[PDB]
Amino acid sequence: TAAAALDVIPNIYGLAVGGSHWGAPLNAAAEIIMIKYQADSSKSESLS
Amino acid sequence: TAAAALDVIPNIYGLAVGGSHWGAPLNAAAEIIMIKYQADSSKSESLS
Amino acid sequence: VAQKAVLGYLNNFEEVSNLEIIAGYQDGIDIENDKTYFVARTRMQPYR
Amino acid sequence: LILYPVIINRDWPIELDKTHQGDFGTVDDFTLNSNYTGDELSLYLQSSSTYKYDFSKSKNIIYGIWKEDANNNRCWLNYKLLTPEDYEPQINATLVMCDKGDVNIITGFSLPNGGVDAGGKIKVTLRVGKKLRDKFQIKQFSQTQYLQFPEASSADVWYIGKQIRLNTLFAKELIGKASRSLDLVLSWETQNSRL
Amino acid sequence: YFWRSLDASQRNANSQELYPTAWSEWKAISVPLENVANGIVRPIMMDNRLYISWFEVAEEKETDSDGNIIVSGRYRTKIRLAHLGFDGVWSSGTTLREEVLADQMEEMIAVVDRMEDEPRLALVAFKEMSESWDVVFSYICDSMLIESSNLPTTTHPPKPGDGDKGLSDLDDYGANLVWFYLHETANGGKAEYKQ
Amino acid sequence: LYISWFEVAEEKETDSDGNIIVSGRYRTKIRLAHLGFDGVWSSGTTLRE
C-alpha cells in the first residue's frame, strides 16, 4: 500500500511534466487481496 | 534489494528531468518478504 | 510462540490507541436520539 | 463542525427583504403576515400609510396583493376595490406557489389602471425555510479529541451541555512496559494507572 | 545494516573488565534504507523503544513564472524515522515534515532525547556548513508521534531588520542545539564530530 | 453507507502558440464509494471531472 501511495507523486520536471502511474494504487490493492488469499490458503495446510 | 537500490537514481537528462520510481524499494521489500515465505513453505515439504 | 502472537496483537493495539478522528455525520436532526457515524485515520504511515 | 442532513422546515417562509414603490411611501408602509399553510404560503397584508401614497382623492383604488418576478408578472392575487379613506385596510390570500423559488410580491394601493398610478405599494421577498440546522461540535483540548453538546434551551434532555472524551494517550504506557514484558503491562498498577 | 549494543554494567567488582555477555549480538535491520540521502543514520533508544532515523533528498527542476527554468536549483527533502515493535520486527518507517529547500542542505544529522522538561521529547536536526550562520533544518516530536507544541520564541524573529525571514522557532531551537554541539565544542572540536 | 472525497493534479497546458499557459490548471475529480450489503467496500467510482 505504502509503495503505491508513494508512487502517486509526479516524476518529471523542467520543460515537461509527467505525473505518475495513475492505476498503481488500484493494482496494488488487487494484489493485496491476492496476497491475503495466499496466506489463508497456506494456513489451512498447517491445520490439516 | 540491489536492483531497486540501483533504480533509485534519476533517469532523465536535458531540458527535463524525470527521477526514478520512488516506490520501487518498498515494493521490492514486500516481494522479498513473500520470497522468504516461499522458501520456508517449500522447506516444510522436504521435512514432511 | 504465544508471546510472539500477543506481542503482535499489542503492536496493532498501539495503532488503535493512536487512531485520530477526522469527521462525523449525524443520522438526522434529533441529536438526542439519532445515531451518528465517524471516520478516523492512523497517525503512523501508511495512512489507514 | 458536525454535519447532518439538509431538510426543509415546512413552516412560515423566511422573509428576505422589502422595498417600496409607486409615487410615494416607504418600506414601513405595510405590515405583512405570511404564515405557511401545509403546502401553500398564506399572506395577510395589513395596510398602513394610505396617507403616504393615496387617500380621499383616488377612488376604486385597487388595494392589492399581486405577484412579482423577473418579468413583473403583476397578476392579481387578492385585492379590494375601495377608496383609501380607510387608512389601514386588510387583504389576504393563500398562495399554493409550490415552486420553491424566492417569491416576490407587491402589496399596496393602485388605481384601476393597476400601475403608473398615485396608489403606492411596498414589495416583499420570501423564501422556503431551509433551516432546520442545529449545532453539534467536535472539540480539541490538549492532546485529546472530545465532544460537547449545545447548551440548548430545549426540554431537559439530559444530553444538554454534556461533554464526552474521544481519545486516549494510553499508548505511552504500552511503550514503557511492553518493551520489557507483558507482566508489567498486566500489573494491577497498570490497570489502576491515573493515565 | 545492523545494530548491536554494549552494557557498561556487568563488570566484576574486582575487574577493570566486563563480562563477555556485555556485548550484544549483531542484529539485522529490515527497513528499505537504500534511499538514504548520504550514507548516514542515527539510532536512538528511549523509554526502552529503539528508533532509527535519517533523511532523503532529490533535486527538482523548478521553473519561473516566465516559464524558464529557475537555474538556482532546489531540493525536495524529507526526514525519515522508524522504530522496532515489541514483537521484535521493524516498523515500515515513516516521514515527518517535508521541504523543498532552495539549497542542498546535506551535511548529516544530529539527534538526541531531550529532558529540559519531563516529556522526554524526540528531536532531529540537519545542517549545512556555513561556518558562521550555519544553516539548519529540523523537526521535533512527541513520543506519540505528534509534532511538539511548546518552544521558546525565536532568537532571530522574522525581520530582525532586513533579514526578513528570521527563523522559525523550531529551527531556531534546533540551530541552537547543533551550535551547542559544533561550536560549543569544549567536549570535542567540530572536526571530531564525525566520530 | 457511503464515503466521498476528491482528487486533483496539475497539468502543464500550452497555448495555441505552442508556449506553455503559465497560469497553471488542475485536473480534478469527485470520488465516491459505498458499502455492499455483503459487508465489503465498493471499488469506488468517479463522478463529474
Curated annotation (Swiss-Prot), chain E:
Gene responsible for this protein: yenA2
Job of this protein: Part of an orally active toxin complex (TC) with strong insecticidal effects on larvae of the Coleoptera Costelytra zealandica, Acrossidius tasmania and Adoryphorus couloni and some Lepidoptera larvae. The TC has an endochitinase activity.
Protein name, per record: Toxin subunit YenA2
Compartments, record wording: Secreted
Subunit and partners: Semipurified toxin complex consists of at least YenA1-YenA2-YenB-YenC1-YenC2-Chi1-Chi2. The Yen-TC:K9 subcomplex is about 26 nm tall and 22 nm in diameter with 5-fold symmetry and 5 copies of YenA1, YenA2, Chi1 and Chi2; the chitinase subunits may be solvent accessible on the exterior the complex. The Yen-TC:K9 subcomplex has no insecticidal activity. The native complex with additional YenB, YenC1 and YenC2 subunits is 16 nm taller and is insecticidal; the toxicity-conferring subunits are present at about 1 copy each.
Organism the protein comes from: Yersinia entomophaga
Effect of a null allele: Cells with a disrupted yenA1-yenA2-chi2-yenB-yenC1-yenC2 locus are no longer pathogenic in C.zealandica larvae.
Post-translational modification summary for this protein: The isolated toxin complex includes 3 peptides starting between residues 768 and 778 of this protein, which might be physiologically relevant.
